[PDB]
Ligand binder design. Structure first.
Ligand code: QIC
Ligand code: QIC
Ligand code: NI
Ligand code: NI
Ligand code: NI
Ligand code: NI
Ligand code: NI
Ligand code: NI
Lengths: 251, 251
């Protein structure tokens, strides 16, 4: 039903706020962590794919340690988003799995993101590896250009559950207003008929913004907001996001 | 596809906020108007079915006059919601039509609400009469038991346009979460396929609250908020409503 990471219970109450941190170097990461330190969010996602030379595990881990030193009371989600799913760089399957297992081993991260389309064998063994070390797994899938049919969105979320994800996650891009409703339809069907754990769903862009606010009623356990003044289309600031989620929760 | 009521342009920018004033006597009506001066909304709906002496035209017009003396800078919408459609009192078709014609004649109201299923002939004649006096017509339909199929909702909104409504309006009750999406789908399809003027849609109760907040993206031009108490299930406090509409508008 719920997933507890530290003191945070995902799948209960108002949806949780995730913010993404991007830095190319340890200095960039430190600067961002310091700017994020006082902001009101629940989970810090480190977008590792923006970091240079990720194949040097030690550099990555030094940066993870730096984040933990600065942001000490928020769960840390380690996410290498591959270029094929909108990320900044690509790694071989072996390198990607090695990177994630190194994060797990470090004891510095509370959760890792694993992409559904990495491959069943590798994904499932790494979920097992993360669990042995008390690290939670968000399994993810993204389509930055379009919205698949509701039935296919549900299928992907169900597959993530079958592969052992603690929290299935899907983000899709609407081309029309109807696509936003398609994503919400999939969220409702999944949460009502198949889900046995928290799920995260979102429809990107300004058009899909309602998907970031309607999680409590339709079934999304978390959403993403921005800390920076200058954000992107559909990225509500964390203070405003907290304001709206609280209004809906207390209504 | 816009309607101008005083300086307010409905169908443009963020959705407009309507609040309902409910008072039994002229004394209650004046007291509520005073309180409502301290709320932030765009259109004042007077729910005439809450008024006790509705069959005495002179009392009704005195009450309307009192509202106008207190709330001078907001368009006034005259609405007798029939018991049949979720209101507080029932009237014969003739009494209902004459009440609205009396409101039109007074020169005190900017808009009247006419229920779609009152009867085609009566509705068409009353719309013509309103227009002769430069009074706008919100044509309405309510289902407090269920959410008809999306196509039926669309056909009712289309019919309202055919009968000459300035702003078609429909409120339905969800029995499930998917029903909320059905209402939003009908809003989009009406907007895409047939709307040549603003429309107002809402899924009632707490379950449908998101429908009252997402009008800018899906096509609803106005939304109802509560000042002290709700005039229908699902309305949230007017200050919180404006806050959410603004955050979404800037997203
Ligand atoms: O990383 C994702 O899954 C995001 O959905 C990508 C993009 O949509 C951002 O605007 C979101 O804040 C987060
Ligand atoms: O907000 C609603 O659901 C309403 O039912 C909408 C409209 O019918 C108004 O006349 C009511 O006072 C409230
Ligand atoms: Ni609470
Ligand atoms: Ni170990
Ligand atoms: Ni396990
Ligand atoms: Ni593509
Ligand atoms: Ni604006
Ligand atoms: Ni006249």
């Amino acid at each position: 039903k719920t997933v507890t990471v530290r003191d945070l219970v995902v799948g209960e109450g108002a949806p949780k706020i995730i913010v993404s941190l991007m830095g190319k170097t340890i200095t960039d990461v430190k600067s961002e962590a310091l700017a994020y330190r006082e902001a009101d969010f629940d989970i810090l996602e480190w977008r590792v794919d923006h970091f240079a030379n990720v194949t040097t595990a030690e550099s990555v881990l030094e940066a993870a340690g730096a984040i933990r030193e600065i942001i000490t009371d928020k769960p840390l989600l380690f996410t290498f988003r591959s270029a094929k799913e909108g990320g900044e760089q690509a790694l071989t399957t072996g390198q990607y799995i090695d990177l994630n297992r190194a994060a797990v081993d470090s004891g510095l991260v509370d959760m890792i993101d694993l992409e559904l389309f990495t491959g069943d064998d590798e994904v499932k063994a790494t979920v097992g590896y993360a669990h042995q070390h008390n690290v939670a797994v968000i399994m993810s899938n993204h389509d930055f250009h379009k919205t698949p049919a509701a039935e296919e969105i549900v299928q992907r979320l169900r597959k993530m559950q079958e592969l052992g994800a603690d929290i299935p996650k899907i983000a899709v891009m609407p081309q029309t207003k109807a696509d936003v409703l398609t994503l919400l339809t999939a969220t409702v069907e999944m949460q009502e008929r198949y889900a046995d754990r928290p799920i995260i769903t979102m429809s990107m862009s300004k058009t899909g913004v309602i998907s970031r606010l309607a999680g409590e009623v339709f079934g999304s356990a978390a959403t993403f907001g921005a800390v920076k003044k200058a954000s992107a289309p559909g990225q509500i600031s964390v203070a405003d996001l907290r304001t709206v989620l609280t209004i809906l929760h207390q209504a």
